[PDB]
Structures are given as C-alpha cells and as structure tokens.
Amino acid sequence: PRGSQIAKEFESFLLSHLDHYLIPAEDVAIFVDTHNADHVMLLLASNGFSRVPVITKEKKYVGTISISDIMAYQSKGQLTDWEMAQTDIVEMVNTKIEPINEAATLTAIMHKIVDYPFLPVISDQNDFRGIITRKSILKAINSLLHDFTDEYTITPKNND
Amino acid sequence: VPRGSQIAKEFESFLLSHLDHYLIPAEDVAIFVDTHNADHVMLLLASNGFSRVPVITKEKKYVGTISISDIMAYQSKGQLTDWEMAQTDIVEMVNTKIEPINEAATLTAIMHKIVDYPFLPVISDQNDFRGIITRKSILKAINSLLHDFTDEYTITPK
Numbered sequence A: 001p002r003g004s005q006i007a008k009e010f011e012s013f014l015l016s017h018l019d020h021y022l023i024p025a026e027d028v029a030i031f032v033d034t035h036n037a038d039h040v041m042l043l044l045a046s047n048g049f050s051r052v053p054v055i056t057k058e059k060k061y062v063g064t065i066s067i068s069d070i071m072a073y074q075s076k077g078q079l080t081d082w083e084m085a086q087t088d089i090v091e092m093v094n095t096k097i098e099p100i101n102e103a104a105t106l107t108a109i110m111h112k113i114v115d116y117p118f119l120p121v122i123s124d125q126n127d128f129r130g131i132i133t134r135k136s137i138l139k140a141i142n143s144l145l146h147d148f149t150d151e152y153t154i155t156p157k158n159n160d
Numbered sequence B: 001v002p003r004g005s006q007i008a009k010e011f012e013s014f015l016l017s018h019l020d021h022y023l024i025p026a027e028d029v030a031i032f033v034d035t036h037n038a039d040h041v042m043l044l045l046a047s048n049g050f051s052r053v054p055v056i057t058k059e060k061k062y063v064g065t066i067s068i069s070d071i072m073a074y075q076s077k078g079q080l081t082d083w084e085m086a087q088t089d090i091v092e093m094v095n096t097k098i099e100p101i102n103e104a105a106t107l108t109a110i111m112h113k114i115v116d117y118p119f120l121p122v123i124s125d126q127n128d129f130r131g132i133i134t135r136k137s138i139l140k141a142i143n144s145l146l147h148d149f150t151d152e153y154t155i156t157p158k
C-alpha cells in the first residue's frame, strides 16, 4: 500500500500559513542558463549560497548551480580559467533536485524538504514559481507547534 | 519560572521521547581543526557539498564555523597573496555568528534558533563540542511528529 499521510488537522492548520513556506520567484536569487561559469563561481563564493536555482531568459526552470558543480566540470574537461570565462552554466547545471508542482501535497513537501535544502516549485509548463526552503517550512512548523492548540484540543490516548 | 510562549507540552513530549536522535553526535559530524590551513580547507569545502562546517580545537572544544565565503572575505579584506593564504590557519577567518546552544536548551528555543541557522552546535558548560542539530534532522523528527502524533494522542476541534 501507500505510506501514511500527515494528520488532516495539521495539514489544515499549515494550509492557513501557505504564505510562510512558499517564497515567490521575485524574492529568490537566481542565475540565467546563459551566465558565465567563472562569474557565477565568484558570485556564489561572495554571497555564500550553497546552491541557487538556474532559470532561462523566459523564466523557465532548468536546475540548480553550486561551486562544486562548476569545479567538477572544470576537472572533467581540463578547462583553464580563460576557457571558464567563455563557458555558460547550461552545460554544468545540476538536475538532481526534482522540482515539485504548485499542486503538490503538503505530505510530499514534508518528505522532500528533509532530503533537499529547497524545492523549486514549477507550473505544468515549467515556469519557475519560486522555492520552498527548510527555513520557511520551519517557520510554519514553529507557528504550528505554538498555536495549534488555539483551534484544537489535544488529549493523551492510552494504548495499554 | 516565568516562561513565555512555549510549544505544546504534548508536542515537546513526543519529540523528546520518540525521535531525540536529532542531536547528531560529534563522532558523526564532519569538522575542521582551528589549525587547518585556510587554502586546504577552501579546497575541501569546494570538493564536498558543504555550506558551512564546525571548527573545533585540537582538544575537541568548539571555536566557530567555516565556509568558502568566510575565507574569500578575509582574502579581500587584507588583499593577501596565495602564499600568505597558505600559511594562514582558519582560526583567523572563523565565523562566530552562530551562537552555540547548551546541552540543556529548551526544545522551544531549539525550534526558534533552527529557523535562523542551518545548524546549531551543541556544547557543554566547559565548551566541549557535543555535536550539531541540523534543519534536516529537525525536519526528520517533525515529519515523524506529523505522521505518528495521533498514535498516542487524539486531536479534536475546539
């Protein structure tokens, strides 16, 4: 059979704080597929971002990029610094984090946010809608842990 | 004890009794020593997939954290040459912004602090490094809470 779902009461409460875990595309730092390998490497080391979403000039999701992705590509094809200043990031884009849909179940988001630091949210047409981070989920989880008892009563159950 | 807004005692009880393994021990956490040369640390951080790593002393005592952005910022601050950077240990570029939590910290405080930082170094009263609590390990426990809380508890509308 299929696995367990999160309690309907928890899913109901968290869906009243949707604004918290979904971070819109306009508030998320991104790189374009046509951007320079060396330039985004210098930028990733200055900003100190583990990995950043890569999108196209028409705002469509491509993958993610990190310093370790660029550095692995440099070793793989023995590319010099001058050659890296002429290479776009399309060729070294990480596609391991499978993007979730806008209509994803909160039970799936909770399972996937454990595995990845962030989940890119896309439309059925692959338009980058934004990201869901471990931090934004924990903000909503924190409100749940403090305010769940405002609309709900929890009583212990004895199974013995 | 005049405590403020606390997490529900039922949630705190469940998280403490079933999945208290969110306190990743010091033996399972990758670390750097404060004497490790900056360039080799930078090369290691760029080879492995790590945003920032805890820095402990030779005597397993907490010092701070290190990231590529910490080393690179120190390099431009003093426009240091690559041979000057080779001799340099990471203890001069260490990041002490993440204030370590105590072993005796409340779960309510851990939950407020894990939102702010990707991980919380857990230390003793003598600053002995005990391990870390990550956003990932907290989310594993939170996931078990969201699925199995109703095993020992009944939730009814108020």
Ligand SMILES: [Pt+2]
Residues within 6 Å of the ligand: A041, A067, A070, A071, B046
């Ligand atoms: Pt690099």
Ligand SMILES: [Pt+2]
Residues within 6 Å of the ligand: A045, B042, B068, B071, B072
């Ligand atoms: Pt560097």
